[PDB]
Scaffold this active site. Structure first.
Site, PDB file in Angstrom:
ATOM      1  N   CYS A  30       0.909  -1.213   0.001  1.00  0.00           N
ATOM      2  CA  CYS A  30       0.125  -0.103   0.048  1.00  0.00           C
ATOM      3  C   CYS A  30       0.928   1.211   0.122  1.00  0.00           C
ATOM      4  O   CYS A  30       1.581   1.534   0.951  1.00  0.00           O
ATOM      5  CB  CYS A  30      -1.026   0.016   1.195  1.00  0.00           C
ATOM      6  N   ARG A  73       0.226   4.563   3.052  1.00  0.00           N
ATOM      7  CA  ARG A  73      -0.141   4.143   4.487  1.00  0.00           C
ATOM      8  C   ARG A  73       0.520   5.353   5.341  1.00  0.00           C
ATOM      9  O   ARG A  73       0.130   5.193   6.561  1.00  0.00           O
ATOM     10  CB  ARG A  73       0.914   3.186   4.830  1.00  0.00           C
ATOM     11  N   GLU A  93      -4.572   4.260 -10.735  1.00  0.00           N
ATOM     12  CA  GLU A  93      -5.441   3.021 -10.446  1.00  0.00           C
ATOM     13  C   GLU A  93      -6.648   3.112 -11.632  1.00  0.00           C
ATOM     14  O   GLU A  93      -6.948   2.120 -12.299  1.00  0.00           O
ATOM     15  CB  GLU A  93      -6.276   2.927  -9.147  1.00  0.00           C
TER      16      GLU A  93
HETATM   17  C1  HEM Z   1      -6.129   6.607   2.314  1.00  0.00           C
HETATM   18  C2  HEM Z   1      -6.088   6.339   1.084  1.00  0.00           C
HETATM   19  C3  HEM Z   1      -5.331   5.140   0.224  1.00  0.00           C
HETATM   20  C4  HEM Z   1      -4.567   5.236  -0.722  1.00  0.00           C
HETATM   21  C5  HEM Z   1      -4.066   6.556  -1.560  1.00  0.00           C
HETATM   22  C6  HEM Z   1      -4.173   3.685  -1.007  1.00  0.00           C
HETATM   23  C7  HEM Z   1      -3.342   3.363  -2.053  1.00  0.00           C
HETATM   24  C8  HEM Z   1      -3.204   2.226  -2.484  1.00  0.00           C
HETATM   25  C9  HEM Z   1      -3.058   1.701  -3.838  1.00  0.00           C
HETATM   26  C10 HEM Z   1      -2.712   2.662  -5.059  1.00  0.00           C
HETATM   27  C11 HEM Z   1      -3.018   0.289  -3.838  1.00  0.00           C
HETATM   28  C12 HEM Z   1      -2.596  -0.544  -5.162  1.00  0.00           C
HETATM   29  C13 HEM Z   1      -4.115  -1.198  -5.400  1.00  0.00           C
HETATM   30  C14 HEM Z   1      -3.705  -2.064  -6.661  1.00  0.00           C
HETATM   31  O1  HEM Z   1      -2.967  -1.754  -7.558  1.00  0.00           O
HETATM   32  O2  HEM Z   1      -4.584  -3.254  -6.413  1.00  0.00           O
HETATM   33  C15 HEM Z   1      -3.171  -0.112  -2.632  1.00  0.00           C
HETATM   34  C16 HEM Z   1      -3.308  -1.363  -1.810  1.00  0.00           C
HETATM   35  C17 HEM Z   1      -3.405  -1.658  -0.608  1.00  0.00           C
HETATM   36  N1  HEM Z   1      -4.150  -0.990   0.393  1.00  0.00           N
HETATM   37 FE1  HEM Z   1      -3.783   1.089   0.342  1.00  0.00          FE
HETATM   38  N2  HEM Z   1      -4.745   2.990   0.053  1.00  0.00           N
HETATM   39  C18 HEM Z   1      -5.498   3.782   0.804  1.00  0.00           C
HETATM   40  C19 HEM Z   1      -6.010   3.286   2.087  1.00  0.00           C
HETATM   41  C20 HEM Z   1      -5.907   2.209   2.452  1.00  0.00           C
HETATM   42  C21 HEM Z   1      -6.857   1.658   3.583  1.00  0.00           C
HETATM   43  C22 HEM Z   1      -7.857   2.488   4.700  1.00  0.00           C
HETATM   44  C23 HEM Z   1      -6.362   0.143   3.821  1.00  0.00           C
HETATM   45  C24 HEM Z   1      -6.741  -0.897   4.977  1.00  0.00           C
HETATM   46  C25 HEM Z   1      -7.301  -0.372   5.871  1.00  0.00           C
HETATM   47  C26 HEM Z   1      -5.563  -0.006   2.736  1.00  0.00           C
HETATM   48  C27 HEM Z   1      -4.708  -1.413   2.755  1.00  0.00           C
HETATM   49  C28 HEM Z   1      -4.401  -1.585   1.577  1.00  0.00           C
HETATM   50  C29 HEM Z   1      -4.060  -3.153   1.185  1.00  0.00           C
HETATM   51  C30 HEM Z   1      -4.046  -4.486   2.246  1.00  0.00           C
HETATM   52  C31 HEM Z   1      -3.535  -3.406  -0.085  1.00  0.00           C
HETATM   53  C32 HEM Z   1      -3.004  -4.321  -0.859  1.00  0.00           C
HETATM   54  C33 HEM Z   1      -4.190  -4.919  -1.844  1.00  0.00           C
HETATM   55  C34 HEM Z   1      -3.593  -6.169  -2.702  1.00  0.00           C
HETATM   56  O3  HEM Z   1      -2.451  -6.512  -2.093  1.00  0.00           O
HETATM   57  O4  HEM Z   1      -4.315  -6.569  -3.413  1.00  0.00           O
HETATM   58  N3  HEM Z   1      -5.185   0.972   1.952  1.00  0.00           N
HETATM   59  N4  HEM Z   1      -3.477   1.044  -1.819  1.00  0.00           N
HETATM   60  C1  LIG Z   2      -6.779  -6.557  -5.889  1.00  0.00           C
HETATM   61  N1  LIG Z   2      -6.004  -5.348  -5.514  1.00  0.00           N
HETATM   62  C2  LIG Z   2      -6.711  -4.498  -4.254  1.00  0.00           C
HETATM   63  C3  LIG Z   2      -7.421  -3.089  -4.736  1.00  0.00           C
HETATM   64  C4  LIG Z   2      -8.258  -3.172  -5.747  1.00  0.00           C
HETATM   65  C5  LIG Z   2      -8.946  -2.023  -6.078  1.00  0.00           C
HETATM   66  F1  LIG Z   2      -9.800  -1.711  -7.132  1.00  0.00           F
HETATM   67  C6  LIG Z   2      -8.480  -0.716  -5.195  1.00  0.00           C
HETATM   68  F2  LIG Z   2      -9.125   0.326  -5.699  1.00  0.00           F
HETATM   69  C7  LIG Z   2      -7.644  -0.816  -4.272  1.00  0.00           C
HETATM   70  C8  LIG Z   2      -7.471   0.475  -3.400  1.00  0.00           C
HETATM   71  C9  LIG Z   2      -7.983   0.116  -2.057  1.00  0.00           C
HETATM   72  C10 LIG Z   2      -7.866   1.198  -1.181  1.00  0.00           C
HETATM   73  C11 LIG Z   2      -8.146   1.223   0.243  1.00  0.00           C
HETATM   74  C12 LIG Z   2      -6.989   2.457  -1.760  1.00  0.00           C
HETATM   75  C13 LIG Z   2      -6.683   2.456  -3.153  1.00  0.00           C
HETATM   76  N2  LIG Z   2      -6.453   3.866  -3.274  1.00  0.00           N
HETATM   77  N3  LIG Z   2      -7.111   1.496  -3.934  1.00  0.00           N
HETATM   78  C14 LIG Z   2      -7.082  -2.075  -3.816  1.00  0.00           C
END
Ligand code: HEM
Ligand code: A1A0B
Ligand code: HEM
Ligand code: A1A0B
Ligand code: H4B
Ligand code: H4B
Ligand code: ZN
Lengths: 411, 411
Positions: B108, B111, B285
C-alpha cells in the site's frame, strides 16, 4: 517445479531451470531483497568443480555430453589446475561462456539476441596501448555505420589478484561531468568523480556539456593510462522532435553505442575483470533515465517550459507529458539516422517471446522484474503483467568494485 | 540490521523492524519471488502464542508493557482460549489491530494515513441484511460528500470454518461486466464471472457499461443474498479533460470510493473473513489500470484516435501520449468536484516521507517495490529510486479464496 503466470494473457509457464541455480540472491524465507541494487583471490580446490560444471554443460550443448572428447578435456583441465592452479579456455569455450553470461543476465531486457554475439578474444593483450587498440576495433565493429552489432572484448583473466586488467570507465563512451563555481553541474553529474580522476591523471577537459570522456586503461595490474577514442569512431545522434522545432534549440545529443565496461565476466570459475560489451539502446535509457533522472541531465524543467505547461500544480502531470515528447524525439532522431534503437514496447514484447522460448527449450528464464519493466508507461508494456523468477546461473556478468578503491597504487 | 539506500538522494536508513517479521515471503536463498502476485481451521495450541505476541505489542504501544493490566489480560485471554478454544478482542484491541494491519500492508502506497482510520465494529452482526445495513453506513461515512475518509467495517470472526461472514464482491462498488453475442465485452471484463453469479442468484442486469453491481453477502456461513446499494450513496465522477471537449463524448465515469471487500484481516491469531476497508483513489488506478489495462476498459484505442496520433508505428509512442492525457483528465475531473483523489507524484512523495518516519520511530517499513512504484512514469517518482525491504508483519491483511470455490452450498 515452480509456475509463473502472465496476468494479462492468463498464460502459465513452468520453471525447472531454477534447479540448476547455484549462487545466492540476497533473499531469505523471511525477507525479499528484490529491490536492493547491489546485494552480495580464488583457490585451486574451489576451481575444479566450477570448471567441471561449466565443461559438462558446454559438451552437453554441442551434443557430445560424456564423449571421449569431454572426458579428455575434463582430465586435461583437471591436470592444468594441478600444474598451474588455474586453467585456460578454448576459443569455442570462451564464445559459449560469453554468450551464456548474457543469456543468464536476469536484468537484461534485450536477451532475445543472446546467441548473436561477436566475441573478440583479447587474451593475448599485455599493455594499456594494446587494450586501446582492441577497444577501438570493438567500437568500430559494433557501430557498423549505425547498423549496430552486439559484441564483447575479453581481456586476460585475473591470476594472482594484483595483476588485473581493468577499464576504469563505467562505459566505453560517456559524457563528462564537471561541477561549477556556483555549485551546480554541467555535463553528466554521474561521472563528476571519474571526470575528475581523468583530470588528476592528466586529462585536459574541454569543460562543456557532451564532452566524450577518454579511456582509462589498466593493464596487468599497472597504473592506468589515458587514451582518446578517435572522434570519427564515436557516432552521435542529434535529438530533434517531429513536431517541435524549438527542440533543436534545446541542443541535445547522445552517443549511439551503449557499452558497459566495469563488470566482471565469470566462466567456469575464471574471472575476466575487463570484458567491455555493447548492444544498442532502448529509447527509455536515454530519454527517461539519462535525460530526466533528477541526478542526471534533468531536463523536465525546460521541456515543460518550452511546451507552456501548468507547472504550478503537481497534479497537472506536466512532468509526465514532457516525458512522452522527449522519448518520441530520442526515438525519432535515432531512426531517421539509420542508427539502431528499440522502443520500450517492441523491446518488452520481444522479451516475453524470448521468455517463452527459454521455458520451452531450456526450462526457464531468470528475470528481474524490477529491472525488466521500463521506467515509464510500465503497465502498458506486457512485462509489467508477467511474473518472473529471479535466480543466478553461471556463466554470468557480476558487479565489481570501482578500481580506484582497490588499486594498490604506485607512481 | 540491514540497510536500504535511495539512489536519487543518497539517503540510507537502517532496518531492524524486519527482525520482528514472522511469516514467510516465498523467496529462498536461491530464488526471489518478489514479482509473483500471490505466493503462499485453526487450533487452540497455535492460538495463545499469536494472542500473547499481539497483546505484548498492544500494551507496549499504550506505554503499559507488563503492567498489572497487561498481565491480567494475558491470563484472561489464556483462560478464554482454554474455555472456548478461541477468544474475543477488546474494542481498543480491535482498533489497534486494524490500524496496524494497514500500517503493515507492504503493497500500500497510502500508508502515511494509517493512524487516521475509522473502525466500525460489526461483530454483533448476525444476518445478511445486517451486513447490508453496516456496509451502507460505511459507504455513506467514508464518502462524506466527496471529502473521503478512511474506514473499515469488521464482521464476526471465523469460528469453526463453515460459519464464515463473507462479502462475495471483490470491492463494494464495481461496474458490471457482460460478455457479448459477438464474443466481445461490455462494462468491466474483470467482473464477468461475478456479474454472472449475481444473475444466477437473481440479479436483473441493466446490461450497459457503468452498471454498479449489487452486494452479495453471506452471513454465518449461509448462502449469500443480493442487495442493491441505494444509488444516492454511490458517488460518481464524470471524466472531462481541461482541453479536449471530445472527452465528454467518450462518456467515461468512475466511482469515488475504492473499497476492498475480499481480503482477510488477521489480529492476534483471529481471522476476520469479512472486513471491507476504503480510502481514496490514486489517479493511476483508474486512468492507467482500470482504463488502459488490455483486459480492462482498454481505451488507448479510442483516446489515440480522437487525438489523431500516428497509430501505424509502434515507436510513435502514441500509447504513451494517450495515457498521459487520460490521467490528467481523471485527476482534473475528481478535483473540480471536491472529490478526494491523489496524483501518483504526491502519493509517492508522501510514502518516502512515511518510510522515513517508520525507520526513525519504528525501525523499518515493510514495502513491496513491485507494487509501490506507480504503473506509469515510474522513474520520475521518488519511490523508483528507493530500495525497499519486503517482509510480513502481523496484524495483517491477507488474500483468501473466492467464496464460490469453497462454499459447501445448499439450496
Ligand atoms: C488513504 C488512502 C489510500 C490510498 C491512496 C491507497 C493506495 C493504494 C493503492 C494505489 C494500492 C494498489 C491497489 C492495486 O494496485 O491493486 C493499495 C493497496 C492496498 N491498500 Fe492502500 N490506499 C489507501 C487506503 C487504505 C486503507 C484504509 C487500507 C486498509 C485499512 C489499505 C490497505 C491496502 C492493502 C491491504 C492493499 C493491498 C491490496 C492487494 O494486495 O491486492 N489502504 N493502496
Ligand atoms: C486487488 N487489488 C486491491 C485493490 C483493488 C482496487 F480496485 C482498489 F481500488 C484498491 C484500493 C484500495 C484502497 C483502500 C485505496 C486505493 N487507492 N485503492 C485495492
Ligand atoms: C542487443 C541489444 C541490447 C539491449 C536492447 C539491451 C537492453 C538492456 C537494458 C535496457 C538494460 C538496463 C540498463 C540499465 O537500466 O542500467 C540492460 C542491462 C544489462 N545488459 Fe542488456 N541489452 C543489449 C545487449 C546486451 C549485451 C550484448 C550484453 C552482454 C554481453 C548485455 C548484458 C546486460 C547486462 C549484464 C545488464 C545488467 C547491467 C546491470 O546489472 O547494471 N546486454 N540491457
Ligand atoms: C550500470 N547499468 C548498466 C548499463 C548502463 C548503461 F548506460 C547502459 F547503456 C547499459 C546498456 C548496455 C547494453 C549492452 C545495452 C543497453 N541497451 N544498455 C547498461
Ligand atoms: C531501488 C531500485 O532497485 C533502483 O531504482 C533500480 C530500480 N530498477 C531499475 N531498473 C533499471 N532498468 N535500471 C535501473 O537503474 C534501476 N534502478
Ligand atoms: C506480475 C506482477 O507481479 C503483476 O503485474 C503486479 C505488478 N505490480 C502491481 N502493482 C500494483 N500496484 N498493482 C498490480 O496489480 C500489480 N500487478
Ligand atoms: Zn525476493
Amino acid at each position: 517445479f515452480l509456475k509463473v503466470k502472465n496476468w494479462e494473457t492468463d498464460v502459465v509457464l513452468t520453471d525447472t531451470l531454477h534447479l540448476k541455480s547455484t549462487l545466492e540472491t540476497g533473499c531469505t524465507e523471511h525477507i525479499c531483497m528484490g529491490s536492493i541494487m547491489l546485494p552480495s583471490v580464488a583457490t585451486k580446490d574451489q576451481l575444479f568443480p566450477l570448471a567441471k560444471e561449466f565443461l559438462d554443460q558446454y559438451y552437453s550443448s554441442i551434443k557430445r555430453f560424456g564423449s571421449k572428447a569431454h572426458m579428455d578435456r575434463l582430465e586435461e583441465v583437471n591436470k592444468e589446475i594441478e600444474s598451474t592452479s588455474t586453467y585456460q579456455l578454448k576459443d569455442t569455450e570462451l564464445i559459449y561462456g560469453a554468450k551464456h553470461a548474457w543469456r543468464n543476465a536476469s536484468r537484461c531486457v534485450g536477451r532475445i539476441q543472446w546467441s548473436k554475439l561477436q566475441v573478440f578474444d583479447a587474451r593475448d593483450c599485455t599493455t594499456a596501448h594494446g587494450m586501446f587498440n582492441y577497444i577501438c576495433n570493438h567500437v568500430k565493429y559494433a557501430t557498423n555505420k549505425g547498423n549496430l552489432r552486439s559484441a564483447i572484448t575479453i581481456f586476460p583473466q585475473r591470476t594472482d589478484g594484483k595483476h588485473d586488467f581493468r577499464v576504469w570507465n563505467s562505459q566505453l563512451i560517456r559524457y563528462a561531468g564537471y561541477k561549477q563555481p556556483d555549485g551546480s553541474t554541467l555535463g553528466d553529474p554521474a561521472n563528476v568523480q571519474f571526470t575528475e580522476i581523468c583530470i588528476q591523471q592528466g586529462w585536459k577537459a574541454p569543460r562543456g556539456r557532451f564532452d566524450v570522456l577518454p579511456l582509462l586503461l589498466q593493464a596487468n595490474g599497472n597504473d592506468p593510462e589515458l587514451f582518446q577514442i578517435p572522434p570519427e569512431l564515436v557516432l552521435e545522434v542529434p535529438i530533434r522532435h517531429p513536431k517541435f522545432d524549438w527542440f533543436k534549440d534545446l541542443g541535445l545529443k547522445w552517443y549511439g553505442l551503449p557499452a558497459v565496461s566495469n563488470m566482471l565476466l565469470e566462466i567456469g570459475g575464471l574471472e575476466f575483470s575487463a570484458c567491455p560489451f555493447s548492444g544498442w539502446y532502448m529509447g527509455t535509457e536515454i530519454g527517461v533515465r539519462d535525460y530526466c533522472d533528477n541526478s542526471r541531465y534533468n531536463i523536465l524543467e525546460e521541456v515543460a517550459k518550452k511546451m507552456d505547461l501548468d507547472m504550478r500544480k503537481t497534479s497537472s502531470l506536466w512532468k509526465d507529458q514532457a516525458l512522452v515528447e522527449i522519448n518520441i524525439a530520442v526515438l525519432y532522431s535515432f531512426q531517421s539516422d539509420k542508427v539502431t534503437i528499440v522502443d520500450h514496447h517492441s523491446a518488452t514484447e520481444s522479451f516475453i517471446k524470448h521468455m517463452e522460448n527459454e521455458y520451452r527449450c531450456r526450462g526457464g528464464c531468470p528475470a528481474d522484474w524490477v529491472w525488466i519493466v521500463p521506467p515509464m508507461s510500465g503497465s502498458i508494456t506486457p512485462v509489467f503483467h508477467q511474473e518472473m523468477l529471479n535466480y543466478r546461473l553461471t556463466p554470468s556478468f557480476e558487479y565489481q568494485p570501482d578500481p580506484w578503491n582497490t588499486h594498490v597504487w604506485k607512481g
